[PDB]
Structure 1
Amino acid sequence: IVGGTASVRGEWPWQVTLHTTSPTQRHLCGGSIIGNQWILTAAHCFYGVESPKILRVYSGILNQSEIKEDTSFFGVQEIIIHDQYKMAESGYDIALLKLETTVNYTDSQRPISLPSKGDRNVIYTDCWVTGWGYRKLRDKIQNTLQKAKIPLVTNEECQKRYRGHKITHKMICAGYREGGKDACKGDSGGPLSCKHNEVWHLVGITSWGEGCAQRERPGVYTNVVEYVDWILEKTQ
């Protein structure tokens, strides 16, 4: 996260850090708890991933340095990638992780609701992107989970900034005209979380952008509301 600030323990309890363990253990992507056995993340995350065997899902993590050889994690039983996914910038950047067992929810590990039936025309004005990613284009994974408030932009404006890509209704963009706050490397797969009537909704999945936090280049997110039928089909 560029231009963000540190979170405190318990602040974003649906946020997970997905680790790979091949050839060595490192943070791979963010993700969001959407069910006791279900993480929603980005399909792009699994580009180099030989199978679910090498994944570890950590929840309830504030600092990456909390994770040690005895820190508990959830195994991944299945990676469900959208059948039309080809590359992040062309959409369908969405994946479900089915965990081997059910998260018992606690103060530090909680679900975020999907965008609700009948909210298709809500204007979300309280949206935040979170993650352990770079604070700038050439940087490092951050120890403490970072947060930044970022405004949504219309798909019409977004398309005008990305005339070499097809910005569709299955994408949602977010950023400041002047730049300065955005996701960056290591944030993808995590949530774009928007609060409406004091309830958090998983509005976007952090996906791609041109640089990080550049002027007039909003970040691009998977528009979760357009995949609700797909999520329900896969999780049922």
Structure 2
Amino acid sequence: VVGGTEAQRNSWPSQISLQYRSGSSWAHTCGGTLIRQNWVMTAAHCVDRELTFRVVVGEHNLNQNNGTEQYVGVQKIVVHPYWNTDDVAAGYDIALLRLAQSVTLNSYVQLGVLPRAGTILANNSPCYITGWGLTRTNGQLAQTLQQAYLPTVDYAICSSSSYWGSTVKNSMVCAGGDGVRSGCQGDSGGPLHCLVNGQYAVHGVTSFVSRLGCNVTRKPTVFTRVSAYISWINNVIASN
């Protein structure tokens, strides 16, 4: 997250850290959202290669014991059928991970609330992106969870030529693009929390940024629109 600030410990209890076995240790590779005691929602591009993964809930500082963490292995990975590894702009960047065990919900570990199917946010809606990604374009990962206010840019504006053009589909959500705040490498798969009628709901799964850099004017961070995949999510969970 570029242009943000450290979040209050455990203030985004649905945020998870997706890590892979790097021989001797574990390395953070993507964010994610806990949606069931044993299911995590993330980006397909985070898990479309054969690696050994684990999920950390109740996390804040990646390098120190905070005393609120729970570590659990990933048992099954379900990538969206239409996803193509080499074509992020086509969309369908979403995947569900079935955990080896159910985590214990408490003050530090909670389920993210999903929007009703088909829900579309008004332009400039108040949202926040959270993650341990780079804090600067070509910078380094954040040790502690960061957050940044990232208001939505509606589809009509986002798909305009001065913005993303045809690269963005209606199955995506754009947010930010002021050249100051944005998602960045390592934030992928994480949540875009939007405040709707007093409650925060996870409207997006962090997907991609421009080749020009993370924080670029008129190049908002692009998210998979969660409300476009509600039926799929429900079907996968029920069949597995």
| TM-score > 0.5 by shorter chain | yes
Measured in 2, the distance between the counterparts of 1:159 and 1:125 equals: 17
Alpha-carbon contact 2:121-2:152 (below 8 Å) kept: no
Is 1:108 matched with 2:104? no
- Size of the alignment, in residue pairs? 228
Secondary structure of 1:229's counterpart equals helix
Residue 46 of structure 2 is matched in structure 1 by 45
Tell me which residue corresponds to 2:231.
229
What amino acid maps onto 2:128 in structure 1? W
Letter in 2 for 1:108: Y
Which residue is 2:168 aligned to? 167
Gaps of 5+ in 1: none
AA of the residue aligned to 1:174: A
Q: Unaligned regions of 5+ residues in structure 2, if any? A: none
Secondary structure at 1:56 match in 2: strand
Tell me the residue number matched to 1:79: 77
Matches of 1:112 and 1:72, distance apart in 2: 17
AA of the residue aligned to 1:179: G
Change (3 A) 1:121 1:84: closer
Q: Distance in 1 between matches of 2:159 and 2:113?
A: 28
Paired amino acid for 2:229: Y
- SS of 1:130's partner is strand
Q: CA deviation at 1:89?
A: 2.0
Secondary structure of the corresponding residue to residue 221 of structure 1: strand
Q: Aligned pair in 2 of structure 1 residues 63, 126: CA closer, same or farther (>3 Å)?
A: same
% identical equivalent positions: 36
Q: CA RMSD in A?
A: 1.8
Residues 121-150 of structure 1, C-alpha deviations (whole Å, 9 max, x = no match): 553722100000011111111111000011
State the SS of the aligned residue for 2:228: helix
Tell me the distance in 1 between the aligned counterparts of 2:15 and 2:110. 9
Structure 2 CA distance for partners of 1:121 and 1:205, relative to 1, 3 Å: closer
Using structure 2 for the length normalisation, give the TM-score.
0.89
Question: Within 5 Å, which residues of 2 pair with 1:195-206?
Answer: 195-206=195-206
What letter matches 2:79 in structure 1? Answer: I
How far apart in 2 are the matches of 1:14 and 1:142?
Answer: 18
TM-score for both structures, normalised by structure 1: 0.91
